[PDB]
Amino acid sequence: GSSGSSGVSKWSPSQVVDWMKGLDDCLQQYIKNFEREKISGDQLLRITHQELEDLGVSRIGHQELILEAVDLLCALNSGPSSG
């Protein structure tokens, strides 16, 4: 095609919000911040402690909670996609 297999990188700023809806309950209060911040996939895939802090996530156990989940979003992409 153009490069290979990429989807989470082109995730809309509103789509990412739906993802948090299926994560830890502690990462819910942050959702309200992700909606106004319009966090796009291109940013999520490259999300860092600094970014999370901006949204409001000051805690540590929570900052990693989301990251640990992101690792799966990338690990699933690199793998075999479609049939």
Side-chain angles (χ1 to χ4, degrees):
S2 255
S3 238
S5 354
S6 225
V8 186
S9 347
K10 309 239 180 297
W11 261 28
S12 251
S14 353
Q15 277 251 227
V16 179
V17 179
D18 203 325
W19 173 64
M20 304 261 290
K21 299 208 150 202
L23 309 183
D24 224 297
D25 249 62
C26 286
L27 322 170
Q28 298 294 310
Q29 62 208 313
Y30 304 137
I31 303 178
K32 292 200 269 159
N33 294 334
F34 271 54
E35 237 295 323
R36 217 128 163 169
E37 284 286 69
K38 306 250 182 115
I39 302 301
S40 39
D42 168 65
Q43 283 253 105
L44 177 85
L45 240 53
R46 69 180 242 165
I47 188 113
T48 186
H49 271 88
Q50 229 73 41
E51 272 224 72
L52 286 179
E53 215 196 323
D54 190 271
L55 298 136
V57 188
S58 256
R59 264 258 210 162
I60 302 297
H62 304 150
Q63 269 194 76
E64 282 274 336
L65 262 170
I66 307 172
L67 299 164
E68 186 188 330
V70 179
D71 211 43
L72 285 149
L73 262 170
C74 207
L76 266 150
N77 268 227
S78 273
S81 299
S82 195

